[PDB]
Amino acid sequence: MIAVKTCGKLYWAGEYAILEPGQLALIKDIPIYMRAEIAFSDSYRIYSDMFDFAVDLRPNPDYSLIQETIALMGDFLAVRGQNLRPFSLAIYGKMEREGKKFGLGSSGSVVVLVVKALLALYNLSVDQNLLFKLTSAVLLKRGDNGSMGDLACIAAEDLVLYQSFDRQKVAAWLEEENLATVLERDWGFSISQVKPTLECDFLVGWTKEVAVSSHMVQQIKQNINQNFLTSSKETVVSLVEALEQGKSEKIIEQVEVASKLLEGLSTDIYTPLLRQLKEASQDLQAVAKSSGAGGGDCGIALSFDAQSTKTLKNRWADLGIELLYQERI
Ligand SMILES: Nc1ncnc2c1ncn2[C@@H]1O[C@H](COP(=O)(O)OP(=O)(O)NP(=O)(O)O)[C@@H](O)[C@H]1O
Numbered sequence: 316m317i318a319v320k321t322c323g324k325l326y327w328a329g330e331y332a333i334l335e336p337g338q339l340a341l342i343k344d345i346p347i348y349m350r351a352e353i354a355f356s357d358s359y360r361i362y363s364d365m366f367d368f369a370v371d372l373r374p375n376p377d378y379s380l381i382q383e384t385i386a387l388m389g390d391f392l393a394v395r396g397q398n399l400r401p402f403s404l405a406i407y408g409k410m411e412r413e414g415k416k417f418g419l420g421s422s423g424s425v426v427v428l429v430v431k432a433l434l435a436l437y438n439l440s441v442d443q444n445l446l447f448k449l450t451s452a453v454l455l456k457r458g459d460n461g462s463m464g465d466l467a468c469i470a471a472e473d474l475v476l477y478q479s480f481d482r483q484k485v486a487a488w489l490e491e492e493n494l495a496t497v498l499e500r501d502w503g504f505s506i507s508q509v510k511p512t513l514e515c516d517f518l519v520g521w522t523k524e525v526a527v528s529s530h531m532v533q534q535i536k537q538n539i540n541q542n543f544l545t546s547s548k549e550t551v552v553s554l555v556e557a558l559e560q561g562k563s564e565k566i567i568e569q570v571e572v573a574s575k576l577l578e579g580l581s582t583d584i585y586t587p588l589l590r591q592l593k594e595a596s597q598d599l600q601a602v603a604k605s606s607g608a609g610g611g612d613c614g615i616a617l618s619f620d621a622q623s624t625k626t627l628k629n630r631w632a633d634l635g636i637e638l639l640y641q642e643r644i
């Protein structure tokens with residue numbers, strides 16, 4: 316057996332705006348892993364601990380995302396002169412607790428995970444951009460309403476500055492042209508590392524209220540206007556520059572602008588608990604905001620001194636917020 320793993324992700328800035336082609340988002344990798352075990356066998360067997368039953372390749376709704384990923388990979392392997400053969404695949408480490416997902420991008424992680432598993436099983440490797448394209452193709456083919464930012468971050472497993480591409484356009488290419496031709500074209504996206512140059516604690520507060528990404532996007536996308544898109548893009552650029560220049564005060568400023576833009580976009584993004592999560596940092600050398608589609612899941616914080624981190628943690632503790640993850644940037 317060969318084992319592989321994929322991380323999770325959490326947006327720092329650029330949410331919603333990133334849905335429009337050419338926009339920017341700053342996305343952070345989270346080392347909480349989805350894991351897989353794969354080996355050739357005499358029949359196809361696929362099991363994910365998110366469910367209480369296994370399936371083979373015959374279509375099943377619970378497993379459709381995984382099966383569609385395998386199907387796309389069957390085509391990729393063909394391009395590379397390889398034929399799909401029966402294998403047993405086990406997926407575990409579901410990014411949920413007590414039946415509730417954390418909000419770490421499990422959908423995107425499992426697609427990258429399965430692509431990684433089949434590549435490893437077939438002794439093949441692909442670079443970062445190709446991995447992103449292969450995993451993105453799966454979501455594009457099923458008409459996903461996401462920006463693919465989660466795939467960009469998980470593929471890179473780093474804090475990345477992601478520039479979105481036109482998903483409707485690439486999906487059209489995939490429906491009309493052979494996969495190799497589509498993969499070889501420049502899609503027009505960008506994924507690059509952002510390395511902060513100052514010390515700081517990164518905290519993740521889980522509100523334990525599940526928020527469905529596709530539902531949030533479906534209802535809030537109509538609220539997106541140009542003023543928001545322009546402001547968001549500038550804010551992501553300024554935040555990246557602040558992190559790279561190591562200026563705490565400018566980071567606090569831009570994260571606050573990002574948060575206010577989200578609040579203005581929709582009253583559904585900030586739930587009372589997500590709002591309390593960011594309010595807990597208002598008088599500290601730290602800053603916080605909702606992360607992702609909002610409507611539940613997690614909030615993130617960046618703290619610039621020991622005292623601020625201690626107080627922020629105590630406040631979140633008293634607020635019923637679970638400290639899901641913490642890291643010294
Ligand atoms: N571990 C898994 N095993 C099998 N399928 C999964 C798994 N994780 C996610 N999926 C599929 O992805 C769907 C939605 O992803 P989910 O993890 O629920 O939230 P999400 O779409 O990632 N939103 P967010 O987690 O906030 O980025 C699930 O309903 C399944 O279809």
Ligand SMILES: C[C@@](O)(CCOP(=O)(O)O)CC(=O)O
Pocket residue numbers: 324325326329330331332333334418419420460461462463464465528532606607608609612
């Ligand atoms: C709202 C959105 O911009 C980010 C969603 O973030 P998350 O999947 O809730 O962590 C949607 C997307 O970009 O796919």
Ligand SMILES: [Mg+2]
Pocket residue numbers: 418526528606607608609611612613
């Ligand atoms: Mg979410």
